[PDB]
Every structure is written in structure tokens, then in C-alpha cells.
């Protein structure tokens, strides 16, 4: 079978795509985003148990087992997966497949599929092999769309941009053409019998082409724009807002420039969608065209010129692969240097404490001379390409005046005729140059559109919700937590089996242990993510059957690490009113203490806010405006009698004693503390 | 040719 | 009398570049990166204290005022400098030149020179006005120095690769020259004789004219990426080497990105040096020349094409600022909607559990309507360029024709001679739009090249060092300060009047809560910053007049920020060492127990660990060898004194030895 | 010569803020 090799979209999705490619080979695709899901990919990167809990959900049968150097060469499964490490960096996870006297070209998903010969494989290789197996819940099928196709549908809306695009560029086109034939006209009439009154007349007729020419020009550029530009800003929205309603798992799984980063691949989706389809649509016809009229003017100049044409198409498609694998090392030098540079920029304090300048000066040296290796090469194959080209071209050229001449002289064409069939040249050679140029866009915009859209694939967190309703009052009653375990992902579990019950009250669990995970279960109270092997108990009858526009409204929490947002003080401290008037506010800082700070500001209350500058105590104005039920706080009154607060603390001070206090250290509570 | 334990299994890191 | 108007290099030079602006108003022109630190520029900006204290070490005479919305009508200076909230969200400070009615001249360093109503400049001068008068001793001078031609000689160590580039280039264009006079013969000397011998003999001979002009341009190429490449290295290496020996107040005083970012302008720097010197040196004498056969085909002709050529030049340079601030408005906007879309990813916790995802969405799609707004600005400014360039070149071409094709018609010229012309008319055109388009490049290179050696003209750490003495003897005992007080720049004091005696081989501890400063009081102690009144004293021969490398290599110092270089653990443990090692480190492992923390990774080799971990900076500390060692949150050693330790809450040393307070309030 | 009015101090030209 084909030696399948999935590419990485992300920095750290080594094992999601040698799960995808084995699943490739053994005949069942799905989109990468989900298979990624499934791993549990953290932002630290993959563990083998992740693979094997994903593998053993598609129905195959995964096996972790340890090898040695001679165990490479053994009668085990062909397809496996292999830990690698690259030079001085963390693990990778690649695929082996056949093993035939070499370590066959394995499927890296970083850079395509690399050979790998077995001199320094096993160099590399750890003892880390993944034994998958179809088994009988495998089901071969294609689960993903084709999402180019899903693309596209942006340009229904603005559909008669497309089609007045297309008829300027067929009139342009048109108008081109005749004026092509100025030369024609003027050195075999014009001249050869001296006709000084036609000639003026001609050329006027020719500068207007020409200036009709140039205004079509003119307008269909300003179409393309727009309609680039709103194709643009729509998919843009889109990604956007789906990304704004997915759940907590897919943004903690996720670094911010990794999220996005997607917002760039909206520009070549949008290259795909209307400059290759404009340019396919229009060059077609402009190369036909063309070749019909070079065939009329003279049959053995265009097949010169389509020779020239395929010659130059040849070395073009010849030279793309290495210019592609070029351009990716150069920026993983460039990305390597400018890591170097900023850990030695931040940590001048220790270089300059132990006199380190010379040997970061020469390490940075080092990693300068090796970009600029990488970047010597690209400029080298740049430097062929264009050779290779330039001397096509010119010989071309040079052989289609030699042949024109011969022709000529033989009787066969007309003396103008051969510069028309040059300036002709122009509407033949530029279309099928423009359609061979397409390779690049259409491949790294494919690439993108599949990146951009496995996220919009996803389930958001409202349809992942079960039955609902029948609890509308707020939720105010006891809460009771019935043994619930939770993994944060696919690591290790952090939340071993936990019962406690909490009778309304004002006070409960202060500490647990500095660093036990006393925020994590007051997000999972808050319905931020799912317990798993337990309920949770409000009294509203098993609470994940409560609408998230309640269970978010009603719970408060501010922490350590609170966010401000860039604005006034009075729309970040209450973000999301629009019920809200100044006098609320006002009110809310006055219980909050908070109402001098707010005054100390130039502005006071229209202060705008630069997201650093006590910003502690704005986060809780900001719940006690939220008016909630249940009122979680960490380490940092107006409230009601029968309102739930959870004062989570590090340190073991007991500030207030007034109500039962829990801990969970490790495992359970174990502690009544009452 | 042994499977590696829970803990060891984890501790195998991968992408980055 | 020209408003002078300066360019902010980074994102925080507003008060540096309208002090600039002042000082060369006057008469007296600096270098920036030497006013921003007279200034006391920090990451956050710079105040109008630092201002105006920047203003009397120059010789202004400064003062400051919170002028009122009524007093403005009248004469408080001409090149008064004002503070003005940009937008509605940040501050900024602009210059105010000339009080007219409903106009006021603004040099704002981020735009230029702008024009605002008095009425519409009232709605953002928060009050401003600081007032600088020219001083008793006030000495004007240039005490700046060009920078192009101190990056240019660089090019003196290759004088034998750009000699070799002008010979390629001048065989390269007189091959070009020569066959482009192919259809010339063609079709006026074999075409209408019908020699079909002398066809093949001169087609072959013109292709390999055309052969040795394309190998002659595949070894030219080589040797100005090779130039660019050797350029570019010396002046990123330099530049780094430079900074790396600057003082601590230049690295606290920007951030990372402003010093990193320095990189990317050594591109433009040899772009300007080797690219457009060798645009000018070949291109003037390959236009000249085309000129000259232009002329010597026909005059009318070369007339016309000089025609078209200025009117090219013309249309270039009239759309030159348009475009700029066009892509300077474009990089704001594209800089502020990637801002808001970190602050919404960051911050979705907040969002998601108040109900914003609506709200940040509707915000989100105005921000990117703005960026879409400017991109379409410079689309109509490309368009109308492109526009205006091809009806020059095409109806130039259309007129050259229809006069070549009337001179033929006439006794003069021919239409082998009007091919011949069309074919030159490449060799002529081509050099002059080049040596019009390369005005963008000197800019931006001109700018680069004032932004380096601004860094690249200060004086480094050892520069500023006193005179060393005779105190070889490692530092130990009676750590004295004699009425010691610190400023972090141009703010608020941190330290003063502090002084304490150390004894000597004791576990004294400074005790004080966040906002005391101890580690103030320990870098102080390290020679990173001096203080600013006073000296530091240890058993005589006061800090100041002694080595640095003994000041390093004696007073190591461990705290809870520890940074972990990118590396071999050997290489971490044992940093610029570069001595005898690989054993003693291992010593250093047992003494602070950190071998058993580091036997545990199974590899035993580099461990680059991808960049607690107090143990792995104690065990570095250890091979110092140190007479003076001071924590932070985490011994041994000998007699001594080997522990300052840092202590912020009470009670976790009760019992070592003598406890100071914040300011030295008890001992 | 002040001649302007309200003439500052350091410990308030100090809470005057030009930066970012
Ligand atoms: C959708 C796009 C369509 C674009 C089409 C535009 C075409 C406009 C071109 C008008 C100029 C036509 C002149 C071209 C003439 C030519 O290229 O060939 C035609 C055959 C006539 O023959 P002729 O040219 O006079 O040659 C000598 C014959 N004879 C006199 C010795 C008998
Ligand atoms: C919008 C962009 C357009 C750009 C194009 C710029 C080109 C503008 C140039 C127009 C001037 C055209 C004048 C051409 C004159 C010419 O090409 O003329 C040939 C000389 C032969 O004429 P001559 O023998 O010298 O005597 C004849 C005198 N007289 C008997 C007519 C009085
Ligand atoms: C929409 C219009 C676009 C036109 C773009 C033209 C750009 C400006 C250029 C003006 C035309 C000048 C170039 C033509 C040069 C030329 O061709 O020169 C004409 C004058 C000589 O006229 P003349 O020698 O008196 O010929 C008389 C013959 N006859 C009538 C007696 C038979
Ligand atoms: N961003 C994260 N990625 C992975 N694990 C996390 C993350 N945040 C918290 N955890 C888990 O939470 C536990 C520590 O919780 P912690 O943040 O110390 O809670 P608290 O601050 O209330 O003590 C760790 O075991 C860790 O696995
Ligand atoms: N990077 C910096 N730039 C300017 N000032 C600083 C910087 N870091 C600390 N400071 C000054 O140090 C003081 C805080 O000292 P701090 O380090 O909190 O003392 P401690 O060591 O007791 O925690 C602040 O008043 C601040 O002005």
C-alpha cells in the first residue's frame, strides 16, 4: 500500500498525526482537530497512554512495548509507531514501516518523509514502540468533508462580483488583442507604402484601445480587492465566533499564538477561492485564444513557443519541492536563533554575575553562520531557477525571430506578421504561466483551509450539553459532590474520589495543601469542565442538566491571576450589563471597597485602563455585581444570608472558624474539620 | 518486549 | 526656523524624540539613545520630571506648569512641549510649535507634523506645557556622527568582490547592448536581401552572445548574495557583542523586543550599502551609455523616451508619503486587532463565565472593519499608481511607434533602426527607474542605520568603570553603606539613607515585606547599578575602585527567579567557567544535594530540558567559590560570610543572627 | 518670570504621567 505521511498543522501534534496517518493506511481518515481531541494533546505535548487510550477508541488494538537495538529487527507489526528525539531538543513520535534492510523513510510528520537509513535511527531511537492492530470495531470509512469545497460558498452571496470580473477581464482581454496588431499595420501599409494620413488616424484609434483598455484594468482591480477583502473578513468572523462558543477543553489544549495563528491562514483560503478560480477561468480561455491566433499567424512559431512554455513549466514544477524544503529549514534556523537571542536577552543578570559573553557571543555566532547557510542555499536554488529560466526564455525568443526570418525569407509569412505573432506572444506565454504558477497557492492554501476549518468541525459547548430545564429558580440549596474523578486531559488524575456536602452556610474548605488543586474543583463546580465517573450535586437534580446561561449567571469567582480587559473601569467591571446603570456600579465598588481607587483615577469612572497599573479587588466589585448565588473566592461583604461562599486559601490560618472546613491534600477529604 | 507501567508509560514524552 | 520634526525609533521614545526635536530646534543635536537615558526612560514611558531634569543637564532651562483652557491665547513659549491622550486610551507627548487661530502645528513623533484646530487640539491636551528656555550655558554643536558611511566601511575588507561585481555587470551590459541589435540586422540586412546563410551564422552568433550574458550573470549573482550575507553577519555580530557589554540600566530600561528587533534593521542596513552602492556605481554608466545610442539612433526618439522617463519619475516620487503612511496606519491597526485578540483568547475564563462572547465578537468584527478600511487606503493608493504608470509606459510605447514609423516614412532612420530602438529602449528605461526606486531602500536603510548606532555609540560597562586599585584580596568583611540611597531611573526612590555594618562570617538576614527593596539592596551590592549618593564599603578600598571580575566572582547570588539556559546540564551548572570542570561540579552536586535531584533523568546526558529549580542555581553558585553568597527563599560553606539570606514574612529564620527591618529601622 | 501661573512641585510634577 501507499506509504501515507500525515503533516503536523501545530507545533506539538506529533502523535495526533501518526495516529492519523496509520489510520491513513489502514483506510479510515478523520479530521486531525478530533483525533487530537481524543489524545488529550496538551500544549506540553502527547504521552504514549494518550496514543494508546485513542488507538484502542478506533478499534485498534494498542500494545506500549519496550525494545532494544537488536529488537529493531524483528518479525513485529510493520506499521508502528517510534519515539525519536532530534538533536537537542524533547521527543517526536514517528512511523516505521517496512524495515528492509534499513530503517525504511519514515513518516515524520515535521518535515515530509525522511529516509532515515539505519546508521543513526537507532542512534535516535529510544525503546518506545506503539504495536497497533485493526481490530473488530475498526470501521473503514472517510469522516471528514472535503473542505475546499465547503469553502467557496462565501462567493453566492457576492456572485455578480465574479461574473462582471470575468466579462472586464474577457473585454480586456479582447481589447488587447487588438491592439496587438499595431505593428502588423504599421510595417506592412503604414510603411511600405507611405501613408502618412492613415497613420495618424490608425494610431489614435490604437491609444484609445489602449486608454479603454487600461480603465477596464482599472475597475476590475478594484472588484478583486473587495471581493478579496470581504472574503477575508468573513471567514475571518466565522473562525472567530465558532472558536468564541467552543468549550474550555480545545482553549487549555492550546497556546494563544497557536489559536491565532489561524487568523492568517483566512488570507490563503481566500487566494484559493477567488484568485486561482478568476485566474483559472479567465487564462483558460485567454491561452486559447492566444494559441488559436498564434496558430493562425504561423503553425511552426507556436509550436516554438509551446515548446518554450512546457520547457519552462517542466523546470518550474522540477524545482518547487526544493524550494518548498529549503524555505521550511531557513525558518527553523531563524526560529532557533531568535530563541537564543531572547533567553539571553532576559537572562543578562546571570551571563553578567558569571562573565558568559563570550561563549552566548559565540554561540549566537554559531547560530547566525547556520542561518545564513540555510539562507545561502535557498538563494543558490533561487539563483538555478532563475538561470534555467532566463536561458529558456532567451533562446526561445532568439529561435522565434531566427524561424520568423527563415519564413519570411522563404515567402511563407508577411514582414509585420512576425512582430505581431511577438507582441501576440505576450497573451499566450503570461496565461499558461499564471495557470503553472498556481501549484504553491493551491497547496498551501488547501493546507491552510484544512487547518483553519477541523477547528470549525468541532462541537461547541452548548450542543454537548444533555436534557435541561425543570429548574428554573436560581440554585441556592445544599451542594454535595458524589465521588467525582477528574484527569484535566489525559495526564495523570488529580482528583481522586471526593464526597463532601456543603448545607448552605458562609463558610467551608480554606486550605487543602499548597498546590493540591483547590481552584480546579471550584472550576469543575462551575461547570467549566465535566467530572468523570461522578456527579455533581447542587440539589438541582444533577446540575450538567442546567442550562449554562444560569449556571454561569449565578457563580462568582475571582482568583490570583485575574484578567483586565483594555477599557474604561466601568465596562470591565461590568462586562456583559446591558441592564447596568453608573449608580449600580457605584454601589457595587461601595460593598467591594474599591470606590476611592476607582476616584483616585484621572478620569474616575471613565478611566481607561491599560491592563497593568489594587487590580485584586475590581474582580470583586465585578462578581459582587454579578449578584450571585454562590460566591467562590481564592486568595485576596454585601451579600446575602443564604449565600454560599468558599474562601479557598494557602495557608493554614483558620481567619474567620465560622463553619465546617474540608481538605483533600492528595486523594479524598479524609477530614471533617467541622 | 515488556510493557511499560503507568507511570513509566506517561513518562514518555512526545512533541515537544 | 524649520519645525523640526523627530522620529520615534521605538515604541516608547515619545519624550526622548520631542526633547530631541527641542535640542535640535536650538541648535544642538544628539544622539537619542544618549537622551533616553538622561531622560530616565523606562519600559512604561518617561515622565515630565525626567523631562525636565534631561532639559537642565542639556542647559534648558525647564519648568512645569498645569496650564489651564484660557490661558493658552497668549506667547508661554514657540517650541513648547505638551502631553496629549491619543485616541482615548494612551498618552503621548507632542510638541506645539506655532498658537494660531484654529490651527496649531503639532510635531507628534509616531505621525509627523500635523495640523489641529484649537478647538479639536483642546479635546485631547490634558495639560501639558513644559516650558524650556535657552540657559546662561547653553553650547550648540553636532555632537552626532554619520552612520552610512561608518556601516560602509565595512565594505573595505571586500574590495576584490564588489571590483569583481562592477566588471560582470559592465561585460554583462555591454553583451546586452551589442545583441540587442539582432533584430536591427534582421530586418534590415538579411530580411530584405534574403541571405539565408548569413541568417544562421549571425543567430548563432547572438546566441552565444546571449549564452556568455547569462553566465555571466549566474556569476555575478553569487557574489552579491555572498556580499549581502557578509555584511549582513559583521554588523548582527557586532551590534550583539556591543550590547552584551552595556550596562544593566540599558537592559531594564527596554524591553526585549526594542533590543531584539535591532536585528532586522542590519537587512536594510546592508541593503543600502551593498545593494543600492552598487545599483548607483553600474546603473549610472549602463543609462548613460543607453542615452548616448539612444541619441546616436535618433534624437526625437531619445527625446521622447526622456519624456516618458521623467513623467515615470514624477508619478514615483508624487505617491512616496501616501504609501508610507498608508502602511503605517495599517501596521497600527493590524498591531491593535492582534492585541485585542491575545487579551480575548487570554481571557476567556472572564469572558465565558460573565456571558461576553457576543459582546467581544461584535467588538472584534469593528476592529477588523478598521484594519480592512486602511488595507483597502492603500489598495486605491497601489491601484492609482499602477493606473497612472501604465498609461505613461503604454502610451509611450504607442507614441514611440507611431514617431519611429513617421521618421521612417521620411528619409531619416529606419525600421531596422526604430527595432533596434525598441530593443535598446531596455537598457535605458530599466537604470533610471532603478535609480529612481532606490529612494525607499536609503530611506529605511537611513533609519536603520541611525537606529543601531544610536545602541552601537554607548558607552559600555567597563567604559564607565573607575580606576582599580591594589585590592586583589577577596572581598570579606564589614560590608559598610554610607548614607546609600537608589533610584531605579528617573522614579520614586527605593532606597535612602540605609546604612548597616555586615560583621564579618555571620548569618545576618534583612527582613522586610514586598515593597522594601532587598534585592535592591543586593544588587546594589553587586556592582549591577551604583548608587546614587554615597559608596559601599568592605574593610576599606571602597566598591567603586576595584575590578569587576573580582566584584563577579565573588558575591554570588542565588534568589526564587532562577533562569535556566537552554543547554548542557554541565554546561548550566558550570556557566563561563571555561576552566577545569566536570569533576568539581560533582562536588558541588553533594554539597548542596542537587546530585540526587539530577540522577533521575534517563538519559544522563545534556538534558536541554527545554528551558524547584533553586537547587540547579545553588549548585551554580557553588563553583564560584564564593566569599559572599546571598539567598533569596533557600549551606555550610567555611568561615566566611556566605549568607545574606532575604526573608519576607516573619518567623522563617527567627534565630541566625542579627535582623534588619525595611529602611534600617532596627537592627 | 514665571509669568504663567500655579507654578508645579517634584512631589507633583511626579504623579504626571507622558509614557506609553
Ligand atoms: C474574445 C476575444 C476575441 C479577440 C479577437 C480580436 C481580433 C482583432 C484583430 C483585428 C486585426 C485583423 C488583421 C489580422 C490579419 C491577419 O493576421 O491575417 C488575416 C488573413 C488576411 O490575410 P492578410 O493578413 O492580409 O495577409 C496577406 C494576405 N494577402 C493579402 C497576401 C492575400
Ligand atoms: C500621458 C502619458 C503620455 C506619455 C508620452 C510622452 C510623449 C510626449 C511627446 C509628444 C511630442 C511628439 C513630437 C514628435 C515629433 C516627431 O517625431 O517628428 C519627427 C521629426 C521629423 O520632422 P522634421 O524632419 O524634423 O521636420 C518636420 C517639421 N515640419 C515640417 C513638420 C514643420
Ligand atoms: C486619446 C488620444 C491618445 C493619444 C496619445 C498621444 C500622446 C501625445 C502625443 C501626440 C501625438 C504626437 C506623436 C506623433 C508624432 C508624429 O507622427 O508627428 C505628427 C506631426 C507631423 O505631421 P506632418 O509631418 O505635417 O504630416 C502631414 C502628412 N500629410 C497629412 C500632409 C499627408
Ligand atoms: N494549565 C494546566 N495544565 C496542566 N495541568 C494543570 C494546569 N493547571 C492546573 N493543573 C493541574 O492542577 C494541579 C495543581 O493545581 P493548582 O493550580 O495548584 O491549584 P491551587 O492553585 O488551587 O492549589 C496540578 O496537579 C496540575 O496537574
Ligand atoms: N525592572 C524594574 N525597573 C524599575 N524598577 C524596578 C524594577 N524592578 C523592581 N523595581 C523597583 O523595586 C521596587 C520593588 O522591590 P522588590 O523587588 O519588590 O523588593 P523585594 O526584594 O523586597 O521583593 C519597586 O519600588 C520598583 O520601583
Known sequence: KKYVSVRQYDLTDSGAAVLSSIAQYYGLKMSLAKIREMTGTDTQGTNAYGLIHAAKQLGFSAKGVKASKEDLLKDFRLPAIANVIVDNRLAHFVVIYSIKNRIITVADPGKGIVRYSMDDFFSIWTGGLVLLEPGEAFQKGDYTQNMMVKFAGFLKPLKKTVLAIFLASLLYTALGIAGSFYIKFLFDDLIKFEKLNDLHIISAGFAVIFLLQIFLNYYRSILVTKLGMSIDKSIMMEYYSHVLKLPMNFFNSRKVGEIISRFMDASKIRQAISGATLTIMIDTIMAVIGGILLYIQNSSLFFISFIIILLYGIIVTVFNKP???????????????????????????????????????????????????????????????????????????????????????????????????????????????????????????????????????????????????????????????????????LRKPVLKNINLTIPKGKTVAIVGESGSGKTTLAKLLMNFYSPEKGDILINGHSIKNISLELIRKKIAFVSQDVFIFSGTVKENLALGNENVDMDEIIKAAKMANAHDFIEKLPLKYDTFLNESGQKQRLAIARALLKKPDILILDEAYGLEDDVTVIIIAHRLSTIVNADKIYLLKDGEIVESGS | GRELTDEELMEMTGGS
Not at chain 1, 378 to 396: D, K
Not at chain 1, 429 to 439: A, C, S
Open chain 1, 323 to 489: 524550494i518548498q524544503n529549503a524555505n521550511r529549514q531557513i525558518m527553523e534556523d531563524n526560529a532557533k536563533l531568535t530563541s537564543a537571542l531572547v533567553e539571553s536577552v532576559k537572562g543578562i543578570e546571570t551571563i553578567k554575575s558569571f562573565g558568559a559573553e563570550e561563549q552566548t557571543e559565540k554561540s549566537t555566532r554559531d547560530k547566525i553562520e547556520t542561518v545564513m547557510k540555510s539562507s545561502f542555499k535557498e538563494g543558490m536554488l533561487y539563483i538555478n531557477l532563475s538561470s534555467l529560466t532566463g536561458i529558456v526564455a532567451g533562446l526561445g525568443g532568439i529561435v522565434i525571430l531566427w524561424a520568423g526570418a527563415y519564413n519570411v525569407i522563404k515567402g511563407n509569412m508577411s514582414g509585420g506578421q512576425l512582430l505581431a505573432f511577438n507582441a501576440l506572444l505576450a497573451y499566450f506565454l503570461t496565461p499558461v504561466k499564471n495557470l503553472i504558477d498556481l501549484q504553491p497557492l493551491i497547496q498551501t492554501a488547501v493546507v491552510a483551509s484544512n487547518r483553519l476549518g477541523e477547528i470549525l468541525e468541532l462541537a461547541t459547548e452548548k450542543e454537548l450539553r444533555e436534557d435541561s430545564d425543570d429548574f428554573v429558580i436560581s440554585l441556592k440549596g445544599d451542594i454535595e459532590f458524589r465521588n467525582v474523578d477528574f484527569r484535566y486531559g
